[model samples]
Structures are given as C-alpha cells and as structure tokens.
Target: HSLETLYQSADCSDANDALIVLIHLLMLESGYIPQGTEAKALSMPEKWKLSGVYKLQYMHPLCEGSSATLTCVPLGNLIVVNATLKINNEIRSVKRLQLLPESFICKEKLGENVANIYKDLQKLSRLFKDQLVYPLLAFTRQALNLPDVF
Candidate 1:
C-alpha cells in the first residue's frame, strides 16, 4: 500500500518518470512480465530495441489471434514451427511449430558434442511427441520473431 502511495504521489514529474523507468528495469531484470507498452509494441529497457524482445510487431511470420490450425510433421524438409501469438496481455492465438531438422542438435562440452547431439536427439525423440503445444507456441511466437535480414 505504502509503496503504491509513493509511486502515486511524486514530488516531481521528472523524478516520477525516472522512478517508473527504473522500476520497469528492475521488474524486467527480475523476470516478471513488463508492462505492455501503450503503443502495443514491445519497448525494451531504456529504449534499447532488440527484435528478440519484441513480439507481435515483427519477426515471427504469423499474425495475432491466429488459431491453432492443423500442422505437419517434418519429413523431407522437416520444417513446420507452431506457436501461439499474444497481444496486449491477452490469450491471442495458438498454432503448431512443425519444423524438422529445422532445428537441430548442439553441444557445449566439446568433442563429445557430436555423439552427445545424437544421444540427446534419441532421448528427445522418445519424448515430446505431443505436449502442451498452446502455451509453448504462444510464448515462442512472442519470443523468436523473423530475423535481422527481415
């Protein structure tokens, strides 16, 4: 209550703006959902723009409120990525990420990375045939958009 009051009663406009921005930074650093921008665009910390942080605006191809339409399993090309899209903190749309070899294996340990990559794929294949596609798609949609060249 007192904290809210302090924010509500600011001595100076400049001070209040700084305080708000600081708190925004703090929350972002703390990993809480930052407030949605009034512009409905993902504004980054201190206007430090990075497409990685901004969803809905660009990057990812599909539009918002899109439905979780049917999907395809990666075969020849193995390329279908399903995801959910969000806007203004709302349950927007859900879809499927059907990408095959579209993504792949990697390792951080070293030489064993080669064998471990296949080893991990084997385990992964055993799992995740079906999972909570909605939330995952939604979050990823907002997370990984198109690319720099786009």
Candidate 2:
C-alpha cells in the first residue's frame, strides 16, 4: 500500500521511474532475485529503449501439440521477428524488432555494417528457431502431454 501510494502520488514526469520500481517489486514478489549485473542493467533504462518485460499466467505445457508460428521479416535496415505459442488452447505472442536510425551517421556506416546486419538477422532467426521451435517440437513429439490428461 505504501508503494502504491507513492506510485500514485508521483508526478507525470516521474511516471516511468515509478513504473520501473513497480516492475522491480513485482519481480521480487515472483521470487526472481536479480543479481548484481541484473540490478545494474535494470538501473540503466536508457539502454533498453526497445526492450520489454512481461509476466504471463497460464497452464503448464504452454503449447498442446506443436501449434506455433514463427516469422522473421527484414525491411530495409529493420528486422522484425514474430513468435506465437499456445497456452491451454490460448495463443500467446511475442514480437521483437531492431531498428536502426536514419540519420547521416547511420547511413554513412550502413555500407560497412551491411554484412554485419545481415549476419545479425540470420543469427536472430536461427536463435528463435533453435530456442523456441526445436524445443517445442521436442515437447510435442517426445515429451509427455499432461495437459490432455488433465
């Protein structure tokens, strides 16, 4: 209640900081203890303009039988990835993207980093496939399907 009061009383200009505090409190409540590095990273919000955190509540074995979709799209200098997983017959999606600025400096370095950008895109796609698809496939085929039993 005290934290909530402080959050409510915070001015509009400090709303983002207040929400960051709320996120940390919620993270603590969930039994996730941030280490020194994590705490330091969380303290620097400027580095995460394109990042996000989420808490989802759902039944176990998020996907029932291999119902997942993954897509990656590259538009100019931007790369977008979309992934969806099923949780108790409900769909949960997570989208991530990286956008480069259009200023003169970025444009000047684009030629040098074009290959690097492509490499990063490939890495991103492979990462999603390896992390989400392969494991989800393993669960769908090899692992026990307890959701159906219940």
Candidate 3:
C-alpha cells in the first residue's frame, strides 16, 4: 500500500512507521496468528491474544536507545506474553497478555500444573539462553525410545 493509502485508514495508529517496524522485527512473527486458523475463521484461536498491545511511540525524552523485557507465563493451554519497555530509566510501556479467563485456569490441579511447567521452562530458558533445547530434548528422546510396557 502507498504511504497515503496506509495513513488513510482507521486501521493505523500514530506510532511512527520506523519504530512500529522495529517492534514487528523484534516481536511479531508470522506464526503469531496461525494461517490455517485465520483462513478457517477460527474465533477460538484469535481469543488466545488476551491483552497484547502494540505501539511505535518515540518513547524517549532525551536519549536515543531503549530496553525491553519479554516474559512468558504458562496458564493451562494458554501462555501470557507480559512485556515492558523502559527509556532512560522511565517505564514507557507495560503491556499485559490477559487471554486467560481466570475461571478457566485458576482452578485446582490444572493451575498447579501450569505453574510447575512455567517454573521449569522459565529456569531452563534462562539457563540455556540462546540455546536450542528443543532439538536437544528430541535427540535424547529418540536415543532412549525403548518402551518396557510391551
């Protein structure tokens, strides 16, 4: 779309194009909205996005650089994407991912299970920063594929 075409809609926000594109580079991936689900008009999948917000504000009063944190919390089959950005020691944004209905996830065993998984993944994620544990785990699983249940 042309620049005029883009700005001539209710779909766009005041976020500058450069910063908006930067966030897209850092956070927005193609799989964010699964292709099949969108084609099938699956409302349930869209509902997974609880409360993620996007912006492209300049965000700095004087400096030029910024910092951000991306946190993941598992809740039942859902994952919350909590993120914040700071510019010059001041919080520029705090975005919450609130897809969980609370009633569905805050129950008994399920909640505990989710929390446990979060604990395990969170610790391992930090420990194995920039590492591919997925393939490593798969390799080990295939190595020990023997099943004694037979």
Candidate 4:
C-alpha cells in the first residue's frame, strides 16, 4: 500500500499532526520518543521502535490458510522503501521498492541492494523466531504432551 493510503487507512487526517500525536503517545506509553524526522529518526535503546516488540495480539487466528493479508507500508514520499512480512511470528519475507510516483509497490520483493537490507532483517527475523515463534511452539507442544492425569 502507498504511504498515503496507509495513512488514510490509519484514519490520520493530518500527517504532521498525527506524527506529533504518535510521538506523544509513544512517550506516554513507553516514556520516550525517537529523535529526528520520518526516515532519519532514531530512538534511544530503551525506546527503539521495533515492530515485533509491538504486541500484536491476535483477535483471530493468523495462519497460512487465513484469508486476511497484513501489510506494512513505509511512510513518506521518497522513491525508495522497504517492507517486511512476518507470518506465525517469523520473518517470512522482505521487499525493497524503488519506484516513481505512479508505480505501485507490490508484495513481491523489488528494486535493488536487497541482500544488505536482508542483513538488518535478519535481526528482526531472529527476534521473532527466538522470542515469539519458537517459545510459543515449544509451549504448545509441551501443553499437548501433558497427560490427562496432570
């Protein structure tokens, strides 16, 4: 999705004002806010904005056969962008797009220098795999193994 579409779908009417509100909400909820503008912003170690760290409680089951498609779209009017897709709490895919104003960036990976981008994605993949996916799978497996006597 385009950033404009994403923002519109987010129901944020004013981008700059909404950004301020987002920053404030982040500060109120996490006690810190990242520095700088859109793409250049960097938060402190305690306040780093990690997507996986954001608790996405599943209101419904999200599995391979699930009909819903979750998307992450970049914000800003820049020609270049990065998108990541995670499934079952694991980094399943990453895509980089470099396009003109009229072009639409699709789900498939496009553009260039994707390998370097994948390096950063590896950290997120590991975090999701180790911290979320594996633990939950292990716990479920253990629970299933529990005998009725217990």
Candidate 5:
C-alpha cells in the first residue's frame, strides 16, 4: 500500500492513530506481513524472522579518509535473510544471503565518524529489534492462545 492509500482511510479525529495506521500500512506494503496460520499448518519452510548480527562499514567524517565499521546484533533466534543498506538517506545496496540458523551481517562504508556511526547503529538496532518483537510476540500469543507468561 502507499501513503495515499493510508490517507484515504485515516479519520480526522486522531492524528496519532492515523499516523500509526499509516505506518502499519507501510509495513504491510513493504512485504512485512505475518505468516498466515494455513501457511504454518502446511509445514512449509518459513523464512527467518528479521533478526541477527550485522556489520556496518563507513568512513570517518572528521578524517574524511579513514574507514570504520559498526556491528548490529538483534536479540533472539531471528535472522535477516535480506536487507537494504542506506547511506545519507540514499539506498546504497540491497543484499540477500542464507544465514546459518541465527546469524546476519550487514556491511557498509560511510563518510562519517566511527563513534557516531556506532552510536547510531546501536540505537537503530534497538529500535528495529523492538519493531520486530512486539508484533511477533503478539501474533504468537494469539495463535497459541497461551497464558500471558508465554
């Protein structure tokens, strides 16, 4: 779906709720939809949930000549089967690879400070992990109809 589609469904009453709905639409349009029960019940192979280790590479902004690296590790058994790397708001590349059960790596080169890059990468890792977790856990709970502890 597109932003235009979201605007069409959004009510004027609550801007925040509309925004949230818009974001969810974006996620769905991005191919991030959860697996259907029928698909799971069929015993078909499933793709790894987006989680794993990542490597980020970039150049130091201050030195303008030095290179740096940042690593991101998403918590849990999830692994990234595909990813898109962006620099300065522009997509640098998209990569797809098979992971060994629970591993993911992302590499990039940037014209920025190493420490700053690391800090931003860490922050992004946390944010992305949270984005992946909440809905996944909710789906799991709903599907299994388990107690809250699960």
Candidate 6:
C-alpha cells in the first residue's frame, strides 16, 4: 500500500518525482542508501522545478570501471526507463526496459507490480555485468566434455 501510494501521486512533481519514486522503491527493497559520489553525485534542489531529470547509479560488483545507471525522465503521461551500462566511462549498452506510469491507476490497467520494479532493475545490473563485463574483464568460460578425447 505504501509503494502504491507514492506511485499513485507521483504526478505532483516532474521528472525529479519519477527519480524519487524509483529511488524510494529501490531503497525499500535493497536497503542501500542511494547517493551520488565525487564522480557520480546528486544535488538536491531547494524548490521543485517545472522540468528536471534525475539519475541513480551503482558500480559493478566485479569490475572497477564498470557501472550501470538508470536515468529517469518525465514523459508527459509516463516515466520511461533509460538504462545504460558503462565500462571505464565508455557506454557499453543502453536499454529501455520498462514504461512506468506517471500517475497511479489500477495495477490491472498496467499489468505491472510496483513493488517488483526494483528487482528487474537489479537483474539488468547483475545480468549485464555477468553476461558481458565479466567475460571482457573478469573470468573465463570453458566447454564441458563428457569424456577425455585422447
């Protein structure tokens, strides 16, 4: 109910609201204090603006220079997902994984679980790191053999 409540009223603000909506949901699920650092830091505004964009970023678990960031923007009636993977500051991949509603309606209307949103976001984080970043920078993969071929 709490998640649904915030999501339902997100239209009160702009893009920043979409940013906060996702951040709050993610925080509740992950238990991580989301912040921006020296290289990636967020500055809060004293007053809400008519237009704004906000971001959430996290580093890859296995690599030093790889990370994934979600860029949230208000798109008229929707808050679209703009996710990207970066390696050493170079963009590796960009994906639009989900379309979030600006204002809450019946969940059945959108066929989405507001609480589970962060789970999929995290999956992209882990999957991209494992699927591409790891192979390029961390580990190796070998084919299995049933028996030794002499």
Error of 3 at 101 (Å): 15
Stronger candidate by TM-score (1 vs 5): 5
All candidates' lDDT scores? Answer: 0.32, 0.35, 0.30, 0.29, 0.30, 0.43
- Evaluated with lDDT, which candidate comes out highest? 6
RMSD of each: 18.3, 15.5, 20.4, 16.2, 21.9, 10.3
* All candidates: TM-score: 0.21, 0.25, 0.25, 0.24, 0.24, 0.43
Best by TM-score: 6
1-150 in candidate 2: lDDT tens per residue?
A: 433432333221222233333333333342333322233223422222222332222112333343443333434544343445554566655444342323112222322322321224344345544654445444443333444321
Off by more than 4 A, model 6: 1-19, 27-51, 62-64, 102-150
Q: Where does candidate 2 stray beyond 4 Å?
A: 1-66, 71-76, 94-128, 135-150
List where candidate 1 sits over 4 angstroms from the true fold.
Answer: 1-59, 63-85, 91-111, 117-122, 132-135, 138-150
Q: lDDT of model 6 at residue 83? A: 58
Q: What tens-digit string does per-residue lDDT give for candidate 3 at 35-149?
A: 1123222122122222443322221212124444433444554434444555456663344443332322223232122342122333333323223222222322333352221
lDDT of 4 by residue, 38-131 (tens): 4222222222223422111111122221111112233454233232333455553233333222222221332222231122334434443454
* Superior by TM-score: candidate 2 or candidate 5: 2
Total clashes, candidate 1? 14
Work out candidate 4's RMSD over C-alphas.
16.2
* Candidate 5 lDDT, 9-99, residue by residue in tens: 3321322222233323333433333222122212211221113233333332221222222223333433332333333444432333222
What TM-score does candidate 1 get on C-alpha atoms? Answer: 0.21
Identify the superior model by TM-score, candidate 2 or candidate 3: 2
lDDT of 1 by residue, 55-133 (tens): 2122223333332222222334443333344455544445444433313333232223224322344333323333323
Of 1 and 6, which scores higher on lDDT? 6
